[PDB]
Design a binder for this molecule. Structure first.
Ligand SMILES: *[C@@H]1O[C@H](CO)[C@@H](O[C@@H]2O[C@H](CO)[C@@H](O[C@@H]3O[C@H](CO[C@@H]4O[C@H](CO)[C@@H](O)[C@H](O)[C@@H]4O)[C@@H](O)[C@H](O[C@@H]4O[C@H](CO)[C@@H](O)[C@H](O)[C@@H]4O)[C@@H]3O)[C@H](O)[C@H]2NC(C)=O)[C@H](O)[C@H]1NC(C)=O
Ligand SMILES: *[C@@H]1O[C@H](CO)[C@@H](O[C@@H]2O[C@H](CO)[C@@H](O[C@@H]3O[C@H](CO)[C@@H](O)[C@H](O)[C@@H]3O)[C@H](O)[C@H]2NC(C)=O)[C@H](O)[C@H]1NC(C)=O
Ligand SMILES: *[C@@H]1O[C@H](CO)[C@@H](O[C@@H]2O[C@H](CO)[C@@H](O)[C@H](O)[C@H]2NC(C)=O)[C@H](O)[C@H]1NC(C)=O
Ligand SMILES: *[C@@H]1O[C@H](CO)[C@@H](O)[C@H](O)[C@H]1NC(C)=O
Lengths: 97, 112, 225
């Protein structure tokens, strides 16, 4: 139960992106740290790579120059200890979390 | 001679019921014709029904081609319906089988 | 010589997808379409590729249409393309006519058509010069060249299917680069005709004869009463 600012579209994603739930579905048994990262990243603004899927699901590749804020359900109160990880495959040589 | 029997037949409610049924099926054809699928596909029913309708309207004009146009030239509703038949028959005669020089389509739903 | 950074693109401002005919989410998985025996002589079929083409353009039957092509340098729009260009079919269909046939285009040197053999910047000699030994054998032979100073377009047929236009820029004074592209269009007409030799007048005469036969049958009904 957590969502964000926007969807596939209104961010420029021409073709289908890759979201967190789909990627947790992608990897059956290995923990999350080896699920998604800079070794696996494929951009959405591609028009040739992965998928012409339906657009409008929540978009979690959030970055600057993008407004993408975080959102949680209003009703119940809780905490979600988020660890932030950088996804760009040619930004730096090391891991930054 | 047989004009009395013909006028008796034209006074019968069954012929008018058949006419009303045919033109109500024409109304349903127009209802399905404003769509795009039945406009040109799954349209053999459209073809045969339209042939039936134009046959019926030609028959109606044959009933109204009598000497009664001595009353279909001064009256009210009567001139309206025969003129409606004329402005029906001429365009689709030059539209369904056109083969002519004309600009485009703007009188299909109008004719219906 | 040539400038390899230049390319030609066809605008796809509104495409046939994202409306009530076809969706982008499906076409990539072998969305094969039909040909109704009009290309050369049978069971020809066509295989669209979404990745290579995209969502095809959408036009209507009996609409004078011209593609508008833009020039791109380093991935940037810079200028629309106004030179003379020609189109052809890779599959080889003939169910599309052309506009005004070169006499109202004020041609004077017997233009060549898609029958001399591919066109390029090399083979093409125009007909708007004043060459002195082929003025005409031509009342109304068409003018298979779009663009330029002339204003001829392509009048579409009633096939209601996808078309793959192979476009070649044909002017030999624009650039040395043999500009060429492939794009896709789709037509959505009004009505196919299966009337055959029975005419409206023929069926009208048949109905009049049948109704007169019915009247001749109903005359004894009054006679017997
Ligand atoms: C931070 O996050 C933001 C968004 O959240 C990112 O901004 C996005 O950056 C993308 C690229 O860096 C932009 O992607 C688009 O890609 C299209 C490529 O499509 C081509 O199409 C031709 C057709 O002939 C093909 O041959 C090619 O192979 C490609 O497939 C471009 O067309 C597109 O250019 C324009 O985009 C605007 C939208 O702003 C359209 O309105 C316009 O019509 C045109 O298509 C663009 O390059 C993406 O638009 C952009 N999004 C936003 C909202 O800015 C940042 O990149 C992220 N930060 C970092 C550092 O990565
Ligand atoms: C493509 O262009 C060539 C010209 O290089 C066209 O050939 C010429 O076409 C005209 C018009 O059809 C011919 O003139 C007439 O031919 C008919 C016979 O079809 C004849 O009865 C008339 O009296 C008159 O001569 C002309 O002869 C012909 N030239 C040659 C050398 O064949 C060709 O028709 C064009 N094709 C298309 C598809 O546009
Ligand atoms: C996501 O929610 C935020 C609210 O925090 C919206 O952010 C605004 O974005 C506009 C667009 O430039 C700015 O002018 C505002 O200053 C922003 N306000 C705040 C509080 O951040 C953003 O519009 C939302 N995204 C979408 C797609 O609706
Ligand atoms: C469609 O083509 C692709 C690639 O050519 C192939 O993998 C797929 O099996 C084909 N599907 C059908 C139904 O022919």
């Amino acid at each position: 139960d957590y969502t964000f600012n926007s969807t596939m579209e209104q961010n420029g994603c021409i073709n289908e992106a890759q979201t967190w739930d789909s990627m947790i579905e992608e990897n059956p048994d290995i923990p999350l740290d080896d699920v998604w990262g800079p070794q696996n990243y494929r951009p959405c603004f591609s028009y040739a790579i992965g998928k012409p899927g339906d657009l409008g699901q929540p978009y979690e590749i959030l970055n600057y120059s993008n407004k993408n804020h975080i959102k949680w359900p209003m009703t119940y109160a809780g905490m979600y200890v988020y660890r932030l990880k950088i996804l760009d495959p040619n930004y730096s040589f090391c891991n930054l979390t | 001679e047989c004009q009395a029997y013909f006028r008796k037949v034209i006074k019968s409610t069954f012929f008018q019921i058949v006419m009303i049924t045919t033109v109500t099926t024409n109304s349903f054809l127009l209802v399905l014709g404003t769509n795009y699928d039945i406009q040109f596909e799954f349209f053999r029913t459209f073809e045969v029904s339209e042939l039936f309708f134009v046959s019926v309207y030609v028959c109606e004009f044959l009933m109204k081609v009598y000497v009664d146009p001595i009353t279909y030239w001064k009256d009210g509703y009567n001139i309206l319906d025969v003129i409606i038949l004329i402005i029906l028959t001429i365009p689709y005669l030059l539209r369904k089988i056109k083969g002519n020089h004309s600009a485009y389509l703007h009188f299909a739903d109008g004719i219906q | 010589g040539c400038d390899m950074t230049k390319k030609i693109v066809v605008q796809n401002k509104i495409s046939a997808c994202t409306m009530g005919i076809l969706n982008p989410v499906q076409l990539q998985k072998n969305y094969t379409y039909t040909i109704e025996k009009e290309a050369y002589d049978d069971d020809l079929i066509v295989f669209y590729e979404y990745k290579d083409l995209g969502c095809p353009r959408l036009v209507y039957y009996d609409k004078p249409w011209k593609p508008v092509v833009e020039l791109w340098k380093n991935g940037i729009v810079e200028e629309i393309m106004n030179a003379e260009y020609v189109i052809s079919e890779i599959n080889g269909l003939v169910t599309y006519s052309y506009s005004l046939t070169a006499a109202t285009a004020n041609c004077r040197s017997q233009p060549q058509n898609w029958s001399t053999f591919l066109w390029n910047r090399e083979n093409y000699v125009s007909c708007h010069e004043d060459n002195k030994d082929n003025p005409l054998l031509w009342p109304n032979v068409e003018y298979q060249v779009l663009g330029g100073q002339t204003n001829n377009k392509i009048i579409f047929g009633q096939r209601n299917g996808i078309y793959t236009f192979h476009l070649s820029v044909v002017d030999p004074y624009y650039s040395y680069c043999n500009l060429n592209t492939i794009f896709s269009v789709y037509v959505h007409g009004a009505l196919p005709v299966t009337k055959f030799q029975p005419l409206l007048t023929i069926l009208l005469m048949v109905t009049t004869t049948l109704l007169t036969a019915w009247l001749a049958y109903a005359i004894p009904k009054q006679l017997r009463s």
